[PDB]
């Protein structure tokens, strides 16, 4: 009794990861009538393994249970094999076992209200391969009731669920049981008694979803899933969580007001491998590797790096100077994957001339490649997430990835080397990263050192317009292979058009419908007729997902590429930080519709009270000055509107060798005032002008103090398509 049909929202299809093709409602994968075991079904979801469908639970009416059935669709041309799972945010609630074509649909009835569940995940796992895995969910119904008791919070101590520190056994299942218990009491406190705890893939919650700016493995094994939670404070009590294998350590997803306090995350076997340089000459480099810390084999005289259940090849190294921990000047990525000769005694001879690149005995090579399958901490469809004194020491990708979320606060902690590991490296990519977010971002009082990329990157994802189908319909593509599939437009959200050739944001529109055709292609229908200037070759970005940014009182040091990247029109405040030997530029304002397809014009940027010490000793993409403003504009001569606007650089201290201070393209209202610049000769000078401007306007350079003393004039600026009258000075 008491069931109503589930109406699956169109937004749930856009949030679904599905391994092949399109997810359909009330039709099979093959776009025919749903049919399982010879029996027809009028309504359901036609998906294909592997897939995972997030299904929100209505607040009204009050839901007691989800009922339905599942099985292989008869439209499959062969005998597929799928395991269906109904999941909460922390546990598998029901599994079908392996289902095959011809088997009758298997029914389920899942408790919702008594588990405190407001989001379910409907997963179809491919089992072996996904050939013929046409997977149906059918007869989906909510069992509903008149009233439900409001839950009044609880304190859940993870030790009461079997979590024990100091043993190399998987503590994942215990912790996930504790999370489930806290959810069904309405949130509160999750207490973790102080200790070192181990986590492995075998007991993680296997989920399938897309993570922006990462590789796209089909399965993320989530060890600490803080998903579908409201009003939860996780008390780490200074614990250390150690991870093994390829996993997502932490996930905050479909949650509100979740905070994590006083917790550290590391891997015993890093994603990267350190080698100490022992000897060099023009043909060879001899190194030593601690094989216990970094297991490896030499296979056909090539490195094979090894962790639990994984092997990775070598692609390149980052080279770190002995004693200082700086990235060696004028190196950047050193690409190599050559002859390795074992010498015994943990010593290896590499067929590699590193001497010529400045490497010396005592230096450290961080051996790595560009693979980034899983971030350390993922925040996804979460509102008001906080990390307080959270240290993310290592990750197989970015340490912290936040996407499609609103309001995020990180205070203290950071991405730094754990004492006693002897490492110089931390994250396998960015420290923190914010892709299509909104509300306020605040990252403060943190230490970010040794990452294989920037300390922060805030941007939108812009899609390419592939075709205008009619006056209301666009075919759009996710253009970069590491930013596909996750939702970027939902019904009701606003679209901003971008003229492709000139990188000029244009008009706006409202999404009426959006259909994901596969992981890289969507069809968007807008409410009103498209502006006539919108054509194939333009781009689109979401006008509802721009965050404000406060990046303050942090230390950023000894990291690959740039210190920080910002592309958002809301206020950006970069204040009180120390950028200490960031390898590349300290700050980059980028934006493009041709390469990374990351966009978001800055309209209000304050960079004040920072200290910049000998940044930009090695060059990377776009690193033309300590502060570089480098949107990519294919036809700059034809551009009318300036991309970036109102950038204020004041009251900073630059301790720098002879390298440009400020490079900017397509920027209007750009002030470099009341800064202190102290020049040294510790690194080789570039011999270029300190200010370089390409199609800029309303530049003011005034009241700076420079040592050794000089007076800056127009002759200290390189001007390209920038009339000299647009550059003003002042005593
Ligand atoms: O330049 C943009 C680029 O910056 C860093 O390298 C990030 O790791 C990438 O994912 C991408 O955002
Ligand atoms: Ca299969
Ligand atoms: Ca156009
Ligand atoms: Na496919
Ligand atoms: Na309790
Ligand atoms: Na012009």
From Swiss-Prot:
GO MF term set: alpha-galactosidase activity
PbH1 repeat windows: 405-436, 546-568, 569-591, 602-623, 644-665
Key words of the record: Glycosidase, Hydrolase, Repeat, Signal
Function: Alpha-galactosidase. Removes both branched alpha-1,3-linked galactose residues of blood group B antigens and linear alpha-1,3-linked galactose structures.
Lineage: Bacteria, Pseudomonadati, Verrucomicrobiota, Verrucomicrobiia, Verrucomicrobiales
Native organism: Akkermansia muciniphila (strain ATCC BAA-835 / DSM 22959 / JCM 33894 / BCRC 81048 / CCUG 64013 / CIP 107961 / Muc)
Record-stated family: Belongs to the glycosyl hydrolase 110 family. B subfamily.
Catalytic activity field: Hydrolysis of terminal, non-reducing branched (1->3)-alpha-D-galactosidic residues, producing free D-galactose; Hydrolysis of terminal, non-reducing linear (1->3)-alpha-D-galactosidic residues, producing free D-galactose; Hydrolysis of terminal, non-reducing alpha-D-galactose residues in alpha-D-galactosides, including galactose oligosaccharides, galactomannans and galactolipids
Origin superkingdom: Bacteria
EC assignment: 3.2.1.n1, 3.2.1.n2, 3.2.1.22
Keyword Glycosyltransferase: no
Protein name: Alpha-1,3-galactosidase B
């Amino acid at each position: 009794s008491g069931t109503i049909a589930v109406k699956v929202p169109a937004s749930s299809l856009l949030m679904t990861r599905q391994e092949t093709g399109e997810t359909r409602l009330d039709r099979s994968f093959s776009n025919a009538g749903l049919s399982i075991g010879g029996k027809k079904y009028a309504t359901g979801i036609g998906t294909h393994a592997t897939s995972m469908i997030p299904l929100p639970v209505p607040e009204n009416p009050k839901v007691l249970r989800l009922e339905g059935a599942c099985g292989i669709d008869d439209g499959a041309d062969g005998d597929g094999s799928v395991e269906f799972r109904v999941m909460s945010g922390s546990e598998v609630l029901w599994s079908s076992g392996v289902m095959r074509r011809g088997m009758a649909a298997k029914k389920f009835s899942i408790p919702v209200a008594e588990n405190g569940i407001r989001h379910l995940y409907l997963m179809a796992d491919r089992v072996d391969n996904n050939s013929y895995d046409h997977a149906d969910w059918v007869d989906l119904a909510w069992k509903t009731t008149g009233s439900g008791q409001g839950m009044k919070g609880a304190v859940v101590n993870a030790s009461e669920f079997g979590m024990v520190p100091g043993v190399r056994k998987d503590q994942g299942p215990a912790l996930r049981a504790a999370v489930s218990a806290l959810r069904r009491q309405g949130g509160g406190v999750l207490n973790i008694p102080r200790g070192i705890y181990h986590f492995y893939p075998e007991g993680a919650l296997n989920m399938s979803f897309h993570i922006s700016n990462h590789d796209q493995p089909l399965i993320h094994p989530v060890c600490v899933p803080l998903a579908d939670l409201r009003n939860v404070r996780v008390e780490g009590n200074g614990s250390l969580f150690l991870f093994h294998g390829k996993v997502v350590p932490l996930l905050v997803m479909d949650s509100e007001n979740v905070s994590i306090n006083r917790l550290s995350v590391d891997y015993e076997r890093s994603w990267c491998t350190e080698a100490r340089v022992v000897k060099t000459d023009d043909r060879f480099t001899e190194v030593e590797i601690d094989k216990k810390a970094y297991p490896y084999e030499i296979r056909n005289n090539r490195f094979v790096f090894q962790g639990k259940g994984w092997e990775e090849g070598m692609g390149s190294c980052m080279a770190f100077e002995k004693g200082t921990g700086h990235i060696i000047a004028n190196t950047s990525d050193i690409g190599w994957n050559g002859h390795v000769e074992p010498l015994g005694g943990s010593r290896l001879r590499l067929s590699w001339n590193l001497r010529q690149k400045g490497i010396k005995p005592g230096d450290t090579l961080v051996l790595r490649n560009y693979n980034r399958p899983h971030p350390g901490c993922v925040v996804y469809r979460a509102r008001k997430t906080s990390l307080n004194d959270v240290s993310l020491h290592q990750s197989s990708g970015m340490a912290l990835l936040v996407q499609r979320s609103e309001d995020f606060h990180m205070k203290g902690g950071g991405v730094m080397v754990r004492k006693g590991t002897g490492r110089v490296h931390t994250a396998g990519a960015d420290a923190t990263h914010f892709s299509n977010t909104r509300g306020g971002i605040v990252v403060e009082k943190a230490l970010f050192e040794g990452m294989m990329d920037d300390a922060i990157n805030v941007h939108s994802t812009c899609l390419g317009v592939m075709e205008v189908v009619d006056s209301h319909t666009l075919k759009c593509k996710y253009m970069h292979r590491q930013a596909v599939g996750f939702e970027v437009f939902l019904p009701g959200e606003k679209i901003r058009f971008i003229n492709g050739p000139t990188l000029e944001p244009g008009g706006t529109a409202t999404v009426k419908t959006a259909v994901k055709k596969n992981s890289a292609e969507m069809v968007i229908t807008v409410e009103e007729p498209l502006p006539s200037s919108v054509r194939a070759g333009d781009a689109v970005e979401n006008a509802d997902f721009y965050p404000s940014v406060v990046f303050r009182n942090n230390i950023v040091r000894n990291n690959r590429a740039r210190g920080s990247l910002f592309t958002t029109p809301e206020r950006v405040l970069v204040e009180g930080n120390l950028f200490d030997h960031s390898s590349g530029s300290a700050i980059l304002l980028a934006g493009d519709a041709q390469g990374w397809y990351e966009s978001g014009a800055c309209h209000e940027v304050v960079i004040r009270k920072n200290t910049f010490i000998n940044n930009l000793t090695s060059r990377y993409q776009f690193t033309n000055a300590i502060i570089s403003i480098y949107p990519e504009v294919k036809q700059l001569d034809r551009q009318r509107d300036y991309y970036h606007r109102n950038v204020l650089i004041e009251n900073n201290v630059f301790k720098t060798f002879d390298v440009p201070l400020l490079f900017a393209i397509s920027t209007d209202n750009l002030k470099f005032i009341n800064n202190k610049v102290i020049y040294n000769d510790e690194f080789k000078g570039w011999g270029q002008k300190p200010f370089q401007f390409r199609r800029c306007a309303n530049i003011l350079i005034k009241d700076n103090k420079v040592l050794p003393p000089r007076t800056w004039t127009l002759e200290d600026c390189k001007l390209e398509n920038t009339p000299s009258d647009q550059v003003r000075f002042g005593g």
